């Protein structure tokens, strides 16, 4: 008999139902987000970090470190091969 | 004047003249309509606060 008032009732529930769950999921991660490679930490030195940076990095990612390890184990084992036989 | 032996035009005219103030305007609603407006104002202001903060976000 009178005029009910829909057009300003969105205060109680934000428009949409499915994207409401994703709103909180995607709005919160943008605060603590790296602008462009912040704190890359590409430089380190712990007597083995240089080897990791030079060979164990994703830029090369080749089979050369495995061959170097094989050569090193051969060099180490030559001495005890002489010692045993 | 077209009617010659009326004997009743005077009566009906007097009745109409006596009943000229047929009734006054009914301006009864002064608070319940105001209640509807204050509810609508509250809804509108909370709505626009929500909208402004959502767009800024």
From Swiss-Prot, chain A:
Domain of life, source organism: Eukaryota
Gene Ontology CC, one term: mitochondrion
Subcellular locations according to the entry: Mitochondrion; Mitochondrion inner membrane
An annotated GO BP: proton transmembrane transport
Main location: mitochondrion
Note: Present with 14600 molecules/cell in log phase SD medium.
Quaternary structure (record): F-type ATPases have 2 components, CF(1) - the catalytic core - and CF(0) - the membrane proton channel. In yeast, the dimeric form of ATP synthase consists of 17 polypeptides: alpha, beta, gamma, delta, epsilon, 4 (B), 5 (OSCP), 6 (A), 8, 9 (C), d, E (Tim11), f, g, h, i/j and k.
Summary of the function given for this chain in its UniProt record: Mitochondrial membrane ATP synthase (F(1)F(0) ATP synthase or Complex V) produces ATP from ADP in the presence of a proton gradient across the membrane which is generated by electron transport complexes of the respiratory chain. F-type ATPases consist of two structural domains, F(1) - containing the extramembraneous catalytic core and F(0) - containing the membrane proton channel, linked together by a central stalk and a peripheral stalk. During catalysis, ATP synthesis in the catalytic domain of F(1) is coupled via a rotary mechanism of the central stalk subunits to proton translocation.
Protein name per the record: ATP synthase subunit f, mitochondrial
Organism: Saccharomyces cerevisiae (strain ATCC 204508 / S288c)
Species classification: Eukaryota, Fungi, Dikarya, Ascomycota, Saccharomycotina
Swiss-Prot record, chain B:
A Gene Ontology term for the protein's cellular component: mitochondrial inner membrane
Keyword Kinase: no
GO molecular function, one term: proton transmembrane transporter activity
GO biological process terms, semicolon-separated: proton motive force-driven ATP synthesis
Main location: mitochondrion
Record key words, sorted: Acetylation, ATP synthesis, CF(0), Hydrogen ion transport, Ion transport, Membrane, Mitochondrion, Mitochondrion inner membrane, Transport
Localization per Swiss-Prot or TrEMBL: Mitochondrion; Mitochondrion inner membrane
Cytoplasm is among the record's keywords: no
Assembly mode: F-type ATPases have 2 components, CF(1) - the catalytic core - and CF(0) - the membrane proton channel. In yeast, the dimeric form of ATP synthase consists of 17 polypeptides: alpha, beta, gamma, delta, epsilon, 4 (B), 5 (OSCP), 6 (A), 8, 9 (C), d, E (Tim11), f, g, h, i/j and k.
More about this protein: Present with 6820 molecules/cell in log phase SD medium.
Role of this protein: Mitochondrial membrane ATP synthase (F(1)F(0) ATP synthase or Complex V) produces ATP from ADP in the presence of a proton gradient across the membrane which is generated by electron transport complexes of the respiratory chain. F-type ATPases consist of two structural domains, F(1) - containing the extramembraneous catalytic core, and F(0) - containing the membrane proton channel, linked together by a central stalk and a peripheral stalk. During catalysis, ATP synthesis in the catalytic domain of F(1) is coupled via a rotary mechanism of the central stalk subunits to proton translocation.
Family, per entry: Belongs to the ATPase d subunit family.
Protein name from the UniProt record: ATP synthase subunit d, mitochondrial
Naturally occurring in which organism (per UniProt): Saccharomyces cerevisiae (strain ATCC 204508 / S288c)
Entire protein: shown range: 61 to 117 of 174
